[PDB]
């Protein structure tokens, strides 16, 4: 877990230059190392509206079998979309009503990082039943 964030943070804003490592970390059978590849595709594509990012980053958010990697998928949403905060309420609102809490957790902190310090009030409109959840 210490080397999870570390190899994600050794590359930062390379925007195409990570994709051999991006693909290699996602394929492996280590769940932490798949999780670390999701942080890596966040930190290499910060503030870019790449369709190739948001496709590949969210395909594993639905499909993957460990739940910790499902969080760090949907936690990486705000790191690539923080520059345009109009899109993050529209894309996380339906993931905030999933069946498992791990998707619903990283849905909430995706709102916290995409809309950083604005008076968005649409993210606040989403967080009202989120703070009234059964799961702690």
């Amino acid at each position: 877990r210490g080397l999870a964030v570390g190899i994600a943070l050794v590359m930062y804003g390379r925007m195409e230059e990570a994709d051999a490592l991006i693909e290699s970390l996602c394929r492996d059978k280590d769940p932490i190392l798949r999780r670390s590849g999701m942080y890596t595709v966040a930190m290499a594509y910060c503030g870019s509206g790449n369709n190739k990012a948001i496709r590949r980053l969210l395909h594993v958010a639905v499909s993957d079998v460990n739940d910790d990697v499902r969080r760090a998928a949907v936690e990486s949403l705000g790191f690539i979309l923080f520059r345009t905060p109009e899109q993050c309420p529209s894309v996380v609102s339906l993931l905030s009503e999933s069946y498992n809490p791990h998707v619903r957790y990283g849905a909430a902190m995706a709102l916290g990082i995409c809309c950083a310090g604005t008076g968005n009030k649409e993210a606040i409109n989403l967080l009202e039943p989120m703070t009234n959840d059964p799961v702690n």
Binding site: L94, E97, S98, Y99
Partner: protein, 48 residues
């Protein structure tokens, strides 16, 4: 026609271009909200 020749030559290129680009976005939002509620039904099943 200072602008009348400019309206039909270099703006009508844009006005014709942004027309169908509006029509697809007008189309997909209809198609998207259909996909939203169909996911809303099945998720309301499974959580129950």
């Amino acid at each position: 026609l200072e602008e009348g020749k400019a309206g039909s030559g270099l703006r009508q290129y844009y006005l014709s271009k942004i027309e169908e680009l509006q029509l697809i976005v007008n189309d997909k939002s209809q198609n998207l909200r259909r996909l939203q509620a169909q996911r809303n039904e099945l998720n309301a099943k499974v959580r129950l």
